[PDB]
Amino acid sequence: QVWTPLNNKFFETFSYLPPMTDAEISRQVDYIVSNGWTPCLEFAGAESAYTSNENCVRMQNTTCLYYDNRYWTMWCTDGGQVLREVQACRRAFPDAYIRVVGFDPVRQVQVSGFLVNRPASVRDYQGPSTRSV
Amino acid sequence: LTYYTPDYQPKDTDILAAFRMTPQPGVPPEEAGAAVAARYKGRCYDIEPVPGEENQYIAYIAYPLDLFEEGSVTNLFTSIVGNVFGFKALRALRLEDLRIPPAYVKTFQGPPHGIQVERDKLNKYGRGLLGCTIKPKLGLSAKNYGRAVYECLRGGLDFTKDDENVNSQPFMRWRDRFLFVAEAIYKSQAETGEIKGHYLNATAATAEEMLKRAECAKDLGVPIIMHDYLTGGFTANTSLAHYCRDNGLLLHIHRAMHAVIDRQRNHGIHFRVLAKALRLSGGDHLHSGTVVGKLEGEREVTLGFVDLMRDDYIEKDRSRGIYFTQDWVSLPGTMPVASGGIHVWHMPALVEIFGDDACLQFGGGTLGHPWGNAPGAAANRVALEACTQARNEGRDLAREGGDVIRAACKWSPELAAACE
Amino acid sequence: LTYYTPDYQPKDTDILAAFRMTPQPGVPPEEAGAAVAARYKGRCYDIEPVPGEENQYIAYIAYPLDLFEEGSVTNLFTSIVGNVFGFKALRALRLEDLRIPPAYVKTFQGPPHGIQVERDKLNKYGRGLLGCTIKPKLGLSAKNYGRAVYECLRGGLDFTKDDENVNSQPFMRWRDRFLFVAEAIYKSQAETGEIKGHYLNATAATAEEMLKRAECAKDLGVPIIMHDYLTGGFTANTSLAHYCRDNGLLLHIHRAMHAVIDRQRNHGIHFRVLAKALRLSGGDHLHSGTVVGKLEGEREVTLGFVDLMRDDYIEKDRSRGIYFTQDWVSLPGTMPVASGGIHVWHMPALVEIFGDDACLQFGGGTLGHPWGNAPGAAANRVALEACTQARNEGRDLAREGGDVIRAACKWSPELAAACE
Amino acid sequence: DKLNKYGRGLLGCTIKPKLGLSAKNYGRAVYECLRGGLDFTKDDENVNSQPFMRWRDRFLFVAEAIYKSQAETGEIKGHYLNATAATAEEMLKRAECAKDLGVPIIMHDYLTGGFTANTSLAHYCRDNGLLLHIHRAMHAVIDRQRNHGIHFRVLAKA
Amino acid sequence: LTYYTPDYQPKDTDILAAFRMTPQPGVPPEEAGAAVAARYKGRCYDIEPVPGEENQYIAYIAYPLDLFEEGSVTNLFTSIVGNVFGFKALRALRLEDLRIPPAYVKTFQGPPHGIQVERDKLNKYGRGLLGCTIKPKLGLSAKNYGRAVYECLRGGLDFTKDDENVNSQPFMRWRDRFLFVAEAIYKSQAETGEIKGHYLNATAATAEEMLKRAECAKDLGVPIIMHDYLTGGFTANTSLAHYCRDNGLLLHIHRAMHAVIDRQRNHGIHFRVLAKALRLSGGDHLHSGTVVGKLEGEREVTLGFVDLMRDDYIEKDRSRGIYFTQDWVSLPGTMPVASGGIHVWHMPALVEIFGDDACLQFGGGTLGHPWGNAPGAAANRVALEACTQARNEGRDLAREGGDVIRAACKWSPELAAACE
Amino acid sequence: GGLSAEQREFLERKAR
């Protein structure tokens, strides 16, 4: 079989697994909470979801390690609350990818980041069986 | 003995070494420790015999901080192990550990970015990184090398790397390879939407040539380069690490020629000291182990030097080979890179042993997947993500790795052709 | 075995290695040689057993010339001994010799000046050179270091040198030492009328700092600098050697950390390979032996690597450890430097063993002469000149060294206080 | 004229927490505050270059945040990047990085860095078209007591 | 004769020359060879008479490798043919061939990219390249020159080139031409989707000006430049080739003033020696022949120097003028460029003679197509592709070239107006 | 672990 290079976009962690269900998202959020970390939600439409070099035109010397759309837009006690917020974000922005992020409150660093929602309207991604043709 | 002072209390600024030495018969251990030790004099303050070994002792030496040049791994190695392995009074001598006082650590820049800055720059969290060594090792043209890089990266791999002996040869000059690899990296980035990279080998004959190759990598905008620090030298490595910090480049470190110094148990320098010297000199990644069949070497020793090269504060643990408490005073950590034959069903073991802050390298070049390079990379990525997800759910990977692999294979056609 | 080809005839451009390997029991020697060997493939073409050793064999490997980067000792060592000492199938492995084909040799600059250009620049002919290591090793201020240098040089010594661990410390910064040593060198030159020099240590943390120290030495007009190539690295050494050729500076090379790689007979890289790598990378002098009591190590082995690092054409001689004929195609030779406890009555032996093309180093700092540093230097110079004159007359030094020393002492008051 | 903002005061925020935040999280906070409608954000006065957040990582992440907020809102945005450093060479290098990123404005502590360093930075900013925000750290040590010291108005004129 | 040694066996590192000499009557051939030959002495080791010529002999001279400066074609030509064509004892003298030992070859960088790297960079495989010389030769403004370049490239030509005498004149300054040609190249690339190029003439009065023109070409991002090596000089050429390797630029070489040295059979230097000197100095393309009517010159001689400038290993073949076996030890090959009146029906002959690794140049400026420059370029491209396809099918081009051309013309309206 | 007489003898000296 051949890995398809057409409409096969991916979003880093857990993006190569089948779309996670509510129970799986809940278990991941519980894992984040268990470690002592804070979960939050990021979202972006299809125009600002993938990495790009749009602003590299303004730079000189080098553009090493600079990529656009690394930041998404921010949307935290347990899995159920984060799931409710996931549904709320889905209703508010149906054409936007949702990403669950984790933040270590002591080190003040991001420790987690996995996609939990892919807009049905957008078709820039494949499915577990359509990834190979 | 003016140089054996068992009542001496080491200062907070002393550099401490733990030597495993086997003196010649008739030489008392106190005399041998005094010799190794011999205001600016090194002194043996502690000698312990090794229970279960033949005439083997651990000698603890304290060196004053004024003895060394600030921020110079070269000087540190010249002072500590310059001419001490040639003493006739010692049948065998092995440096086991070093204690770098914070006062000395603060004089070093350290790794250019570290693990957390690397994760933030690459926007990858919660999982180990994946890499492949482009194979065949040599003979491939820059165009074909770039084609292989693009094929492996588009599958889902986060990194690819040049072979350790690929610097600049008649078959493939370095600038052609850099250009074709840059095109491949950018194509794979556009196709998958994830940030990709390739460990471009900057190891060269002269520091000027090495800096020129780093400069070309910086001008292409590519993320990361590679260096052979034990063959290029600490002086060349430190220059490259300073350059990478200045210009925002990641630095992968390969430990070529390491077994010539850290293989024999009785003679040489233990890899943990070389790992601490690398972290001081600078490196974002450091090839730290081989997985032939399984992770080779005592697990505790591996865990010890992985913690020594990763954490900020490592307490003394003789079980794992930590002879001294090591405070890193906020020096950036180095990401360990486990390479070799990482088979798909062996991923759960390595994910359990290393965790998320490591790079698993398929130095075998994969190619074992009947479909191609890209599906093989996808299978590996699927397996790693499935193992990580299972571990996050509370599963015991060492007991359910096969079950997790099978369950992932049930829905992954690419992994199905890999699991067979 | 695709990699064991006993009928293969090595090409005139192949790089040849002679490995002394002890395979694990049950592993045939042909299989182990095939593994070490494994168009661009290294191949084992010859295996000979070591008569008088336990399961020890010499494996001859042929590498194609296209495998290596032109003028890069770093790449050569990465390719040959990068990851081969870590093979589990080998109980022990030792690289004994290398054959550098002329085609490869011509891609290297080599030593900046060589022996003959050194003699012409220093205007010293027909005798060995003399040097001292300023002692105490550390703690001395730049002013006092310069005073010691001037006192030792005015006596008749041709060179002095910084201690191997003296680079730049709180007690003595490097630029102060360079300035005071320059004043001392010029004072001793004016006083004696002979050209003097001091091995200024340029070994530093970064290549930039090392080049800055070399630049300061060039701006002072002093003749020679020093480098630690096994700790600084081949990349740093090659940069320094290119700089020294460009700016007309001599380069003394110290082999710090050598015993960590060339001491054990079963594992490591023999010093002769490190000496050939140094000659390729560049160095006018290379500390080549210690004289504790007497010249240590098998004489034939020492003579072998001295000839390998000095002569232009060395024929294969297994008695002296030459496993391959080495053609240097007019590459400048490196002057061997024998250091350690060179006592006055031991000068005839070393003059006989080394001849005129060597530097005898009093690394003990002398100080054994009751009168002072300067008369001790004079005594040494008188002894060396008397031994050379006796050898030129047809005397057998190994049999009449004591007679020659006594006869010189009969007229030398300085040597009289030294001979006691 | 450069910022195309007329008829109103400008608005700025100091990214908080003061210290401990990673360059990524600092950039995230900058982007979140700027996208709301703020014209400027600024580094904390004591944020120059620390083990927790090196200066070049912060400059890069802040540049990405500034450009994202500009694209989202359509208004020109900026962040007072702290160029205050130990040596004039390091300070000019940080200003040079800001110039190479195309970001609008940098910051300096003139009473702690010194007038000599400030004048060099101001000449550089005029030469390269960069705005310069000045923070008066250590001012109360000289302009607080009514009987002794130098009144702030003299420091403002200087 | 101390310089005629018929029993001498040339070394593997000797530089060998084969001189065709006609001595004055009364001078024996052995004496004349001894004179040309006259540890560092050149020696005549072999003399053979030319069967079928009047008093003509081939003298073989062996020069030691130490005689020449590493990587210097200038020195090689100064040593070999500096002052030997002015000997009164020789009626005529002609250097026929040179043997460059691998040891010497390794000291040269060679062509910046070579044939295979060129093909990979341009992404063109399996066919010869096509070029045109913009005509009229002179008088055209930079704007009109660019217009002609764009019109010829959009038709399907891979390259265009400046006239040999077009460097920088009042009618067309060089920077205006570079800018307009860059615009034309980019327009043609966007229109056709194939990578295009134009041989920009960097030949200038001073090396500084030549490097400035190369720098402008590099700043425009254009692929290739041109140089006149026999008029600019080997020193200027070697500088340009090093620059092109450093900055990733292709280098086309034009052999202006060649007939002044390689035309007469009795006196001068044969073009094959100039081609080997160019390959050593550096050049990706080398104008190698003219096709006035048909490929001019003995086919075997042309094939010989084409193989000498293309292949890695050329065995001695006196039938094709190869007097010595030439090992290139992986030096990049040079692409031969056949220029002149390449008419459409003459394409099969040149495709058969040269193969795919050559550039056919329409130095006549085409313009013979009644429709325009672009359709004429298309006709040429169609003819070349049809001939290549026929050759790949097993057709005999020398016998079916007309049939293939007619068959291609049956479906190509552009070729129909060209075939008439 | 087992310490040889020498190692044990050294221990006694270190104790003294």
Numbering used by the authors:
A (entry chain P): 2 to 76, 83 to 140
B (entry chain A), C (entry chain L), E (entry chain C): 22 to 59, 79 to 460
D (entry chain I): 160 to 317
F (entry chain Z): 164 to 179
What does the published report state?
As the primary gateway between atmospheric carbon dioxide (CO2) and organic carbon, ribulose-1,5-bisphosphate carboxylase/oxygenase (Rubisco) fixes ~400 gigatons of CO2 annually. Eukaryotic algae concentrate and fix CO2 in phase-separated condensates called pyrenoids, which complete up to one-third of global CO2 fixation. Condensation of Rubisco in pyrenoids is dependent on interaction with disordered linker proteins that show little conservation between species. We report the linker from Chlorella and demonstrate that it binds a conserved site on the Rubisco large subunit.
To determine where CsLinker binds CsRubisco, we elucidated the 3D structure of the α3–α4–CsRubisco complex using cryogenic electron microscopy (cryo-EM). During processing, we observed a low-resolution density in addition to the core subunits at the equatorial region of CsRubisco in the RbcL. We hypothesized that this additional density corresponded to the helical regions of α3–α4 and that substoichiometric binding meant many binding sites were unoccupied, giving rise to poorly resolved density where the linker binds. Using a symmetry expansion approach, with a soft featureless mask around the additional density, we found ~23% of the 8 CsRbcL sites to be occupied by additional density in the symmetry expanded subparticles. We built the helical region of α3 into the density and numbered residues according to their position in the full-length protein. Each CsLinker binding site is contained within the N-terminal region of a single CsRbcL subunit, utilizing two salt bridges on a hydrophobic interface. The two salt bridges are between Arg176 of α3–α4 and Glu51 of the CsRbcL, and between Lys177 of α3–α4 and Asp86 of the third beta-sheet (βC) in CsRbcL. Phe173 of α3–α4 dominates the hydrophobic interaction in a pocket formed by Ile87 and Tyr97 of the CsRbcL. We validated the binding interface by site-directed mutagenesis (SDM) of the α3–α4 fragment, selecting substitutions that disrupted the hydrophobic and salt-bridge interfaces. In both cases, disruption of α3–α4–CsRubisco complex formation by native PAGE was observed.
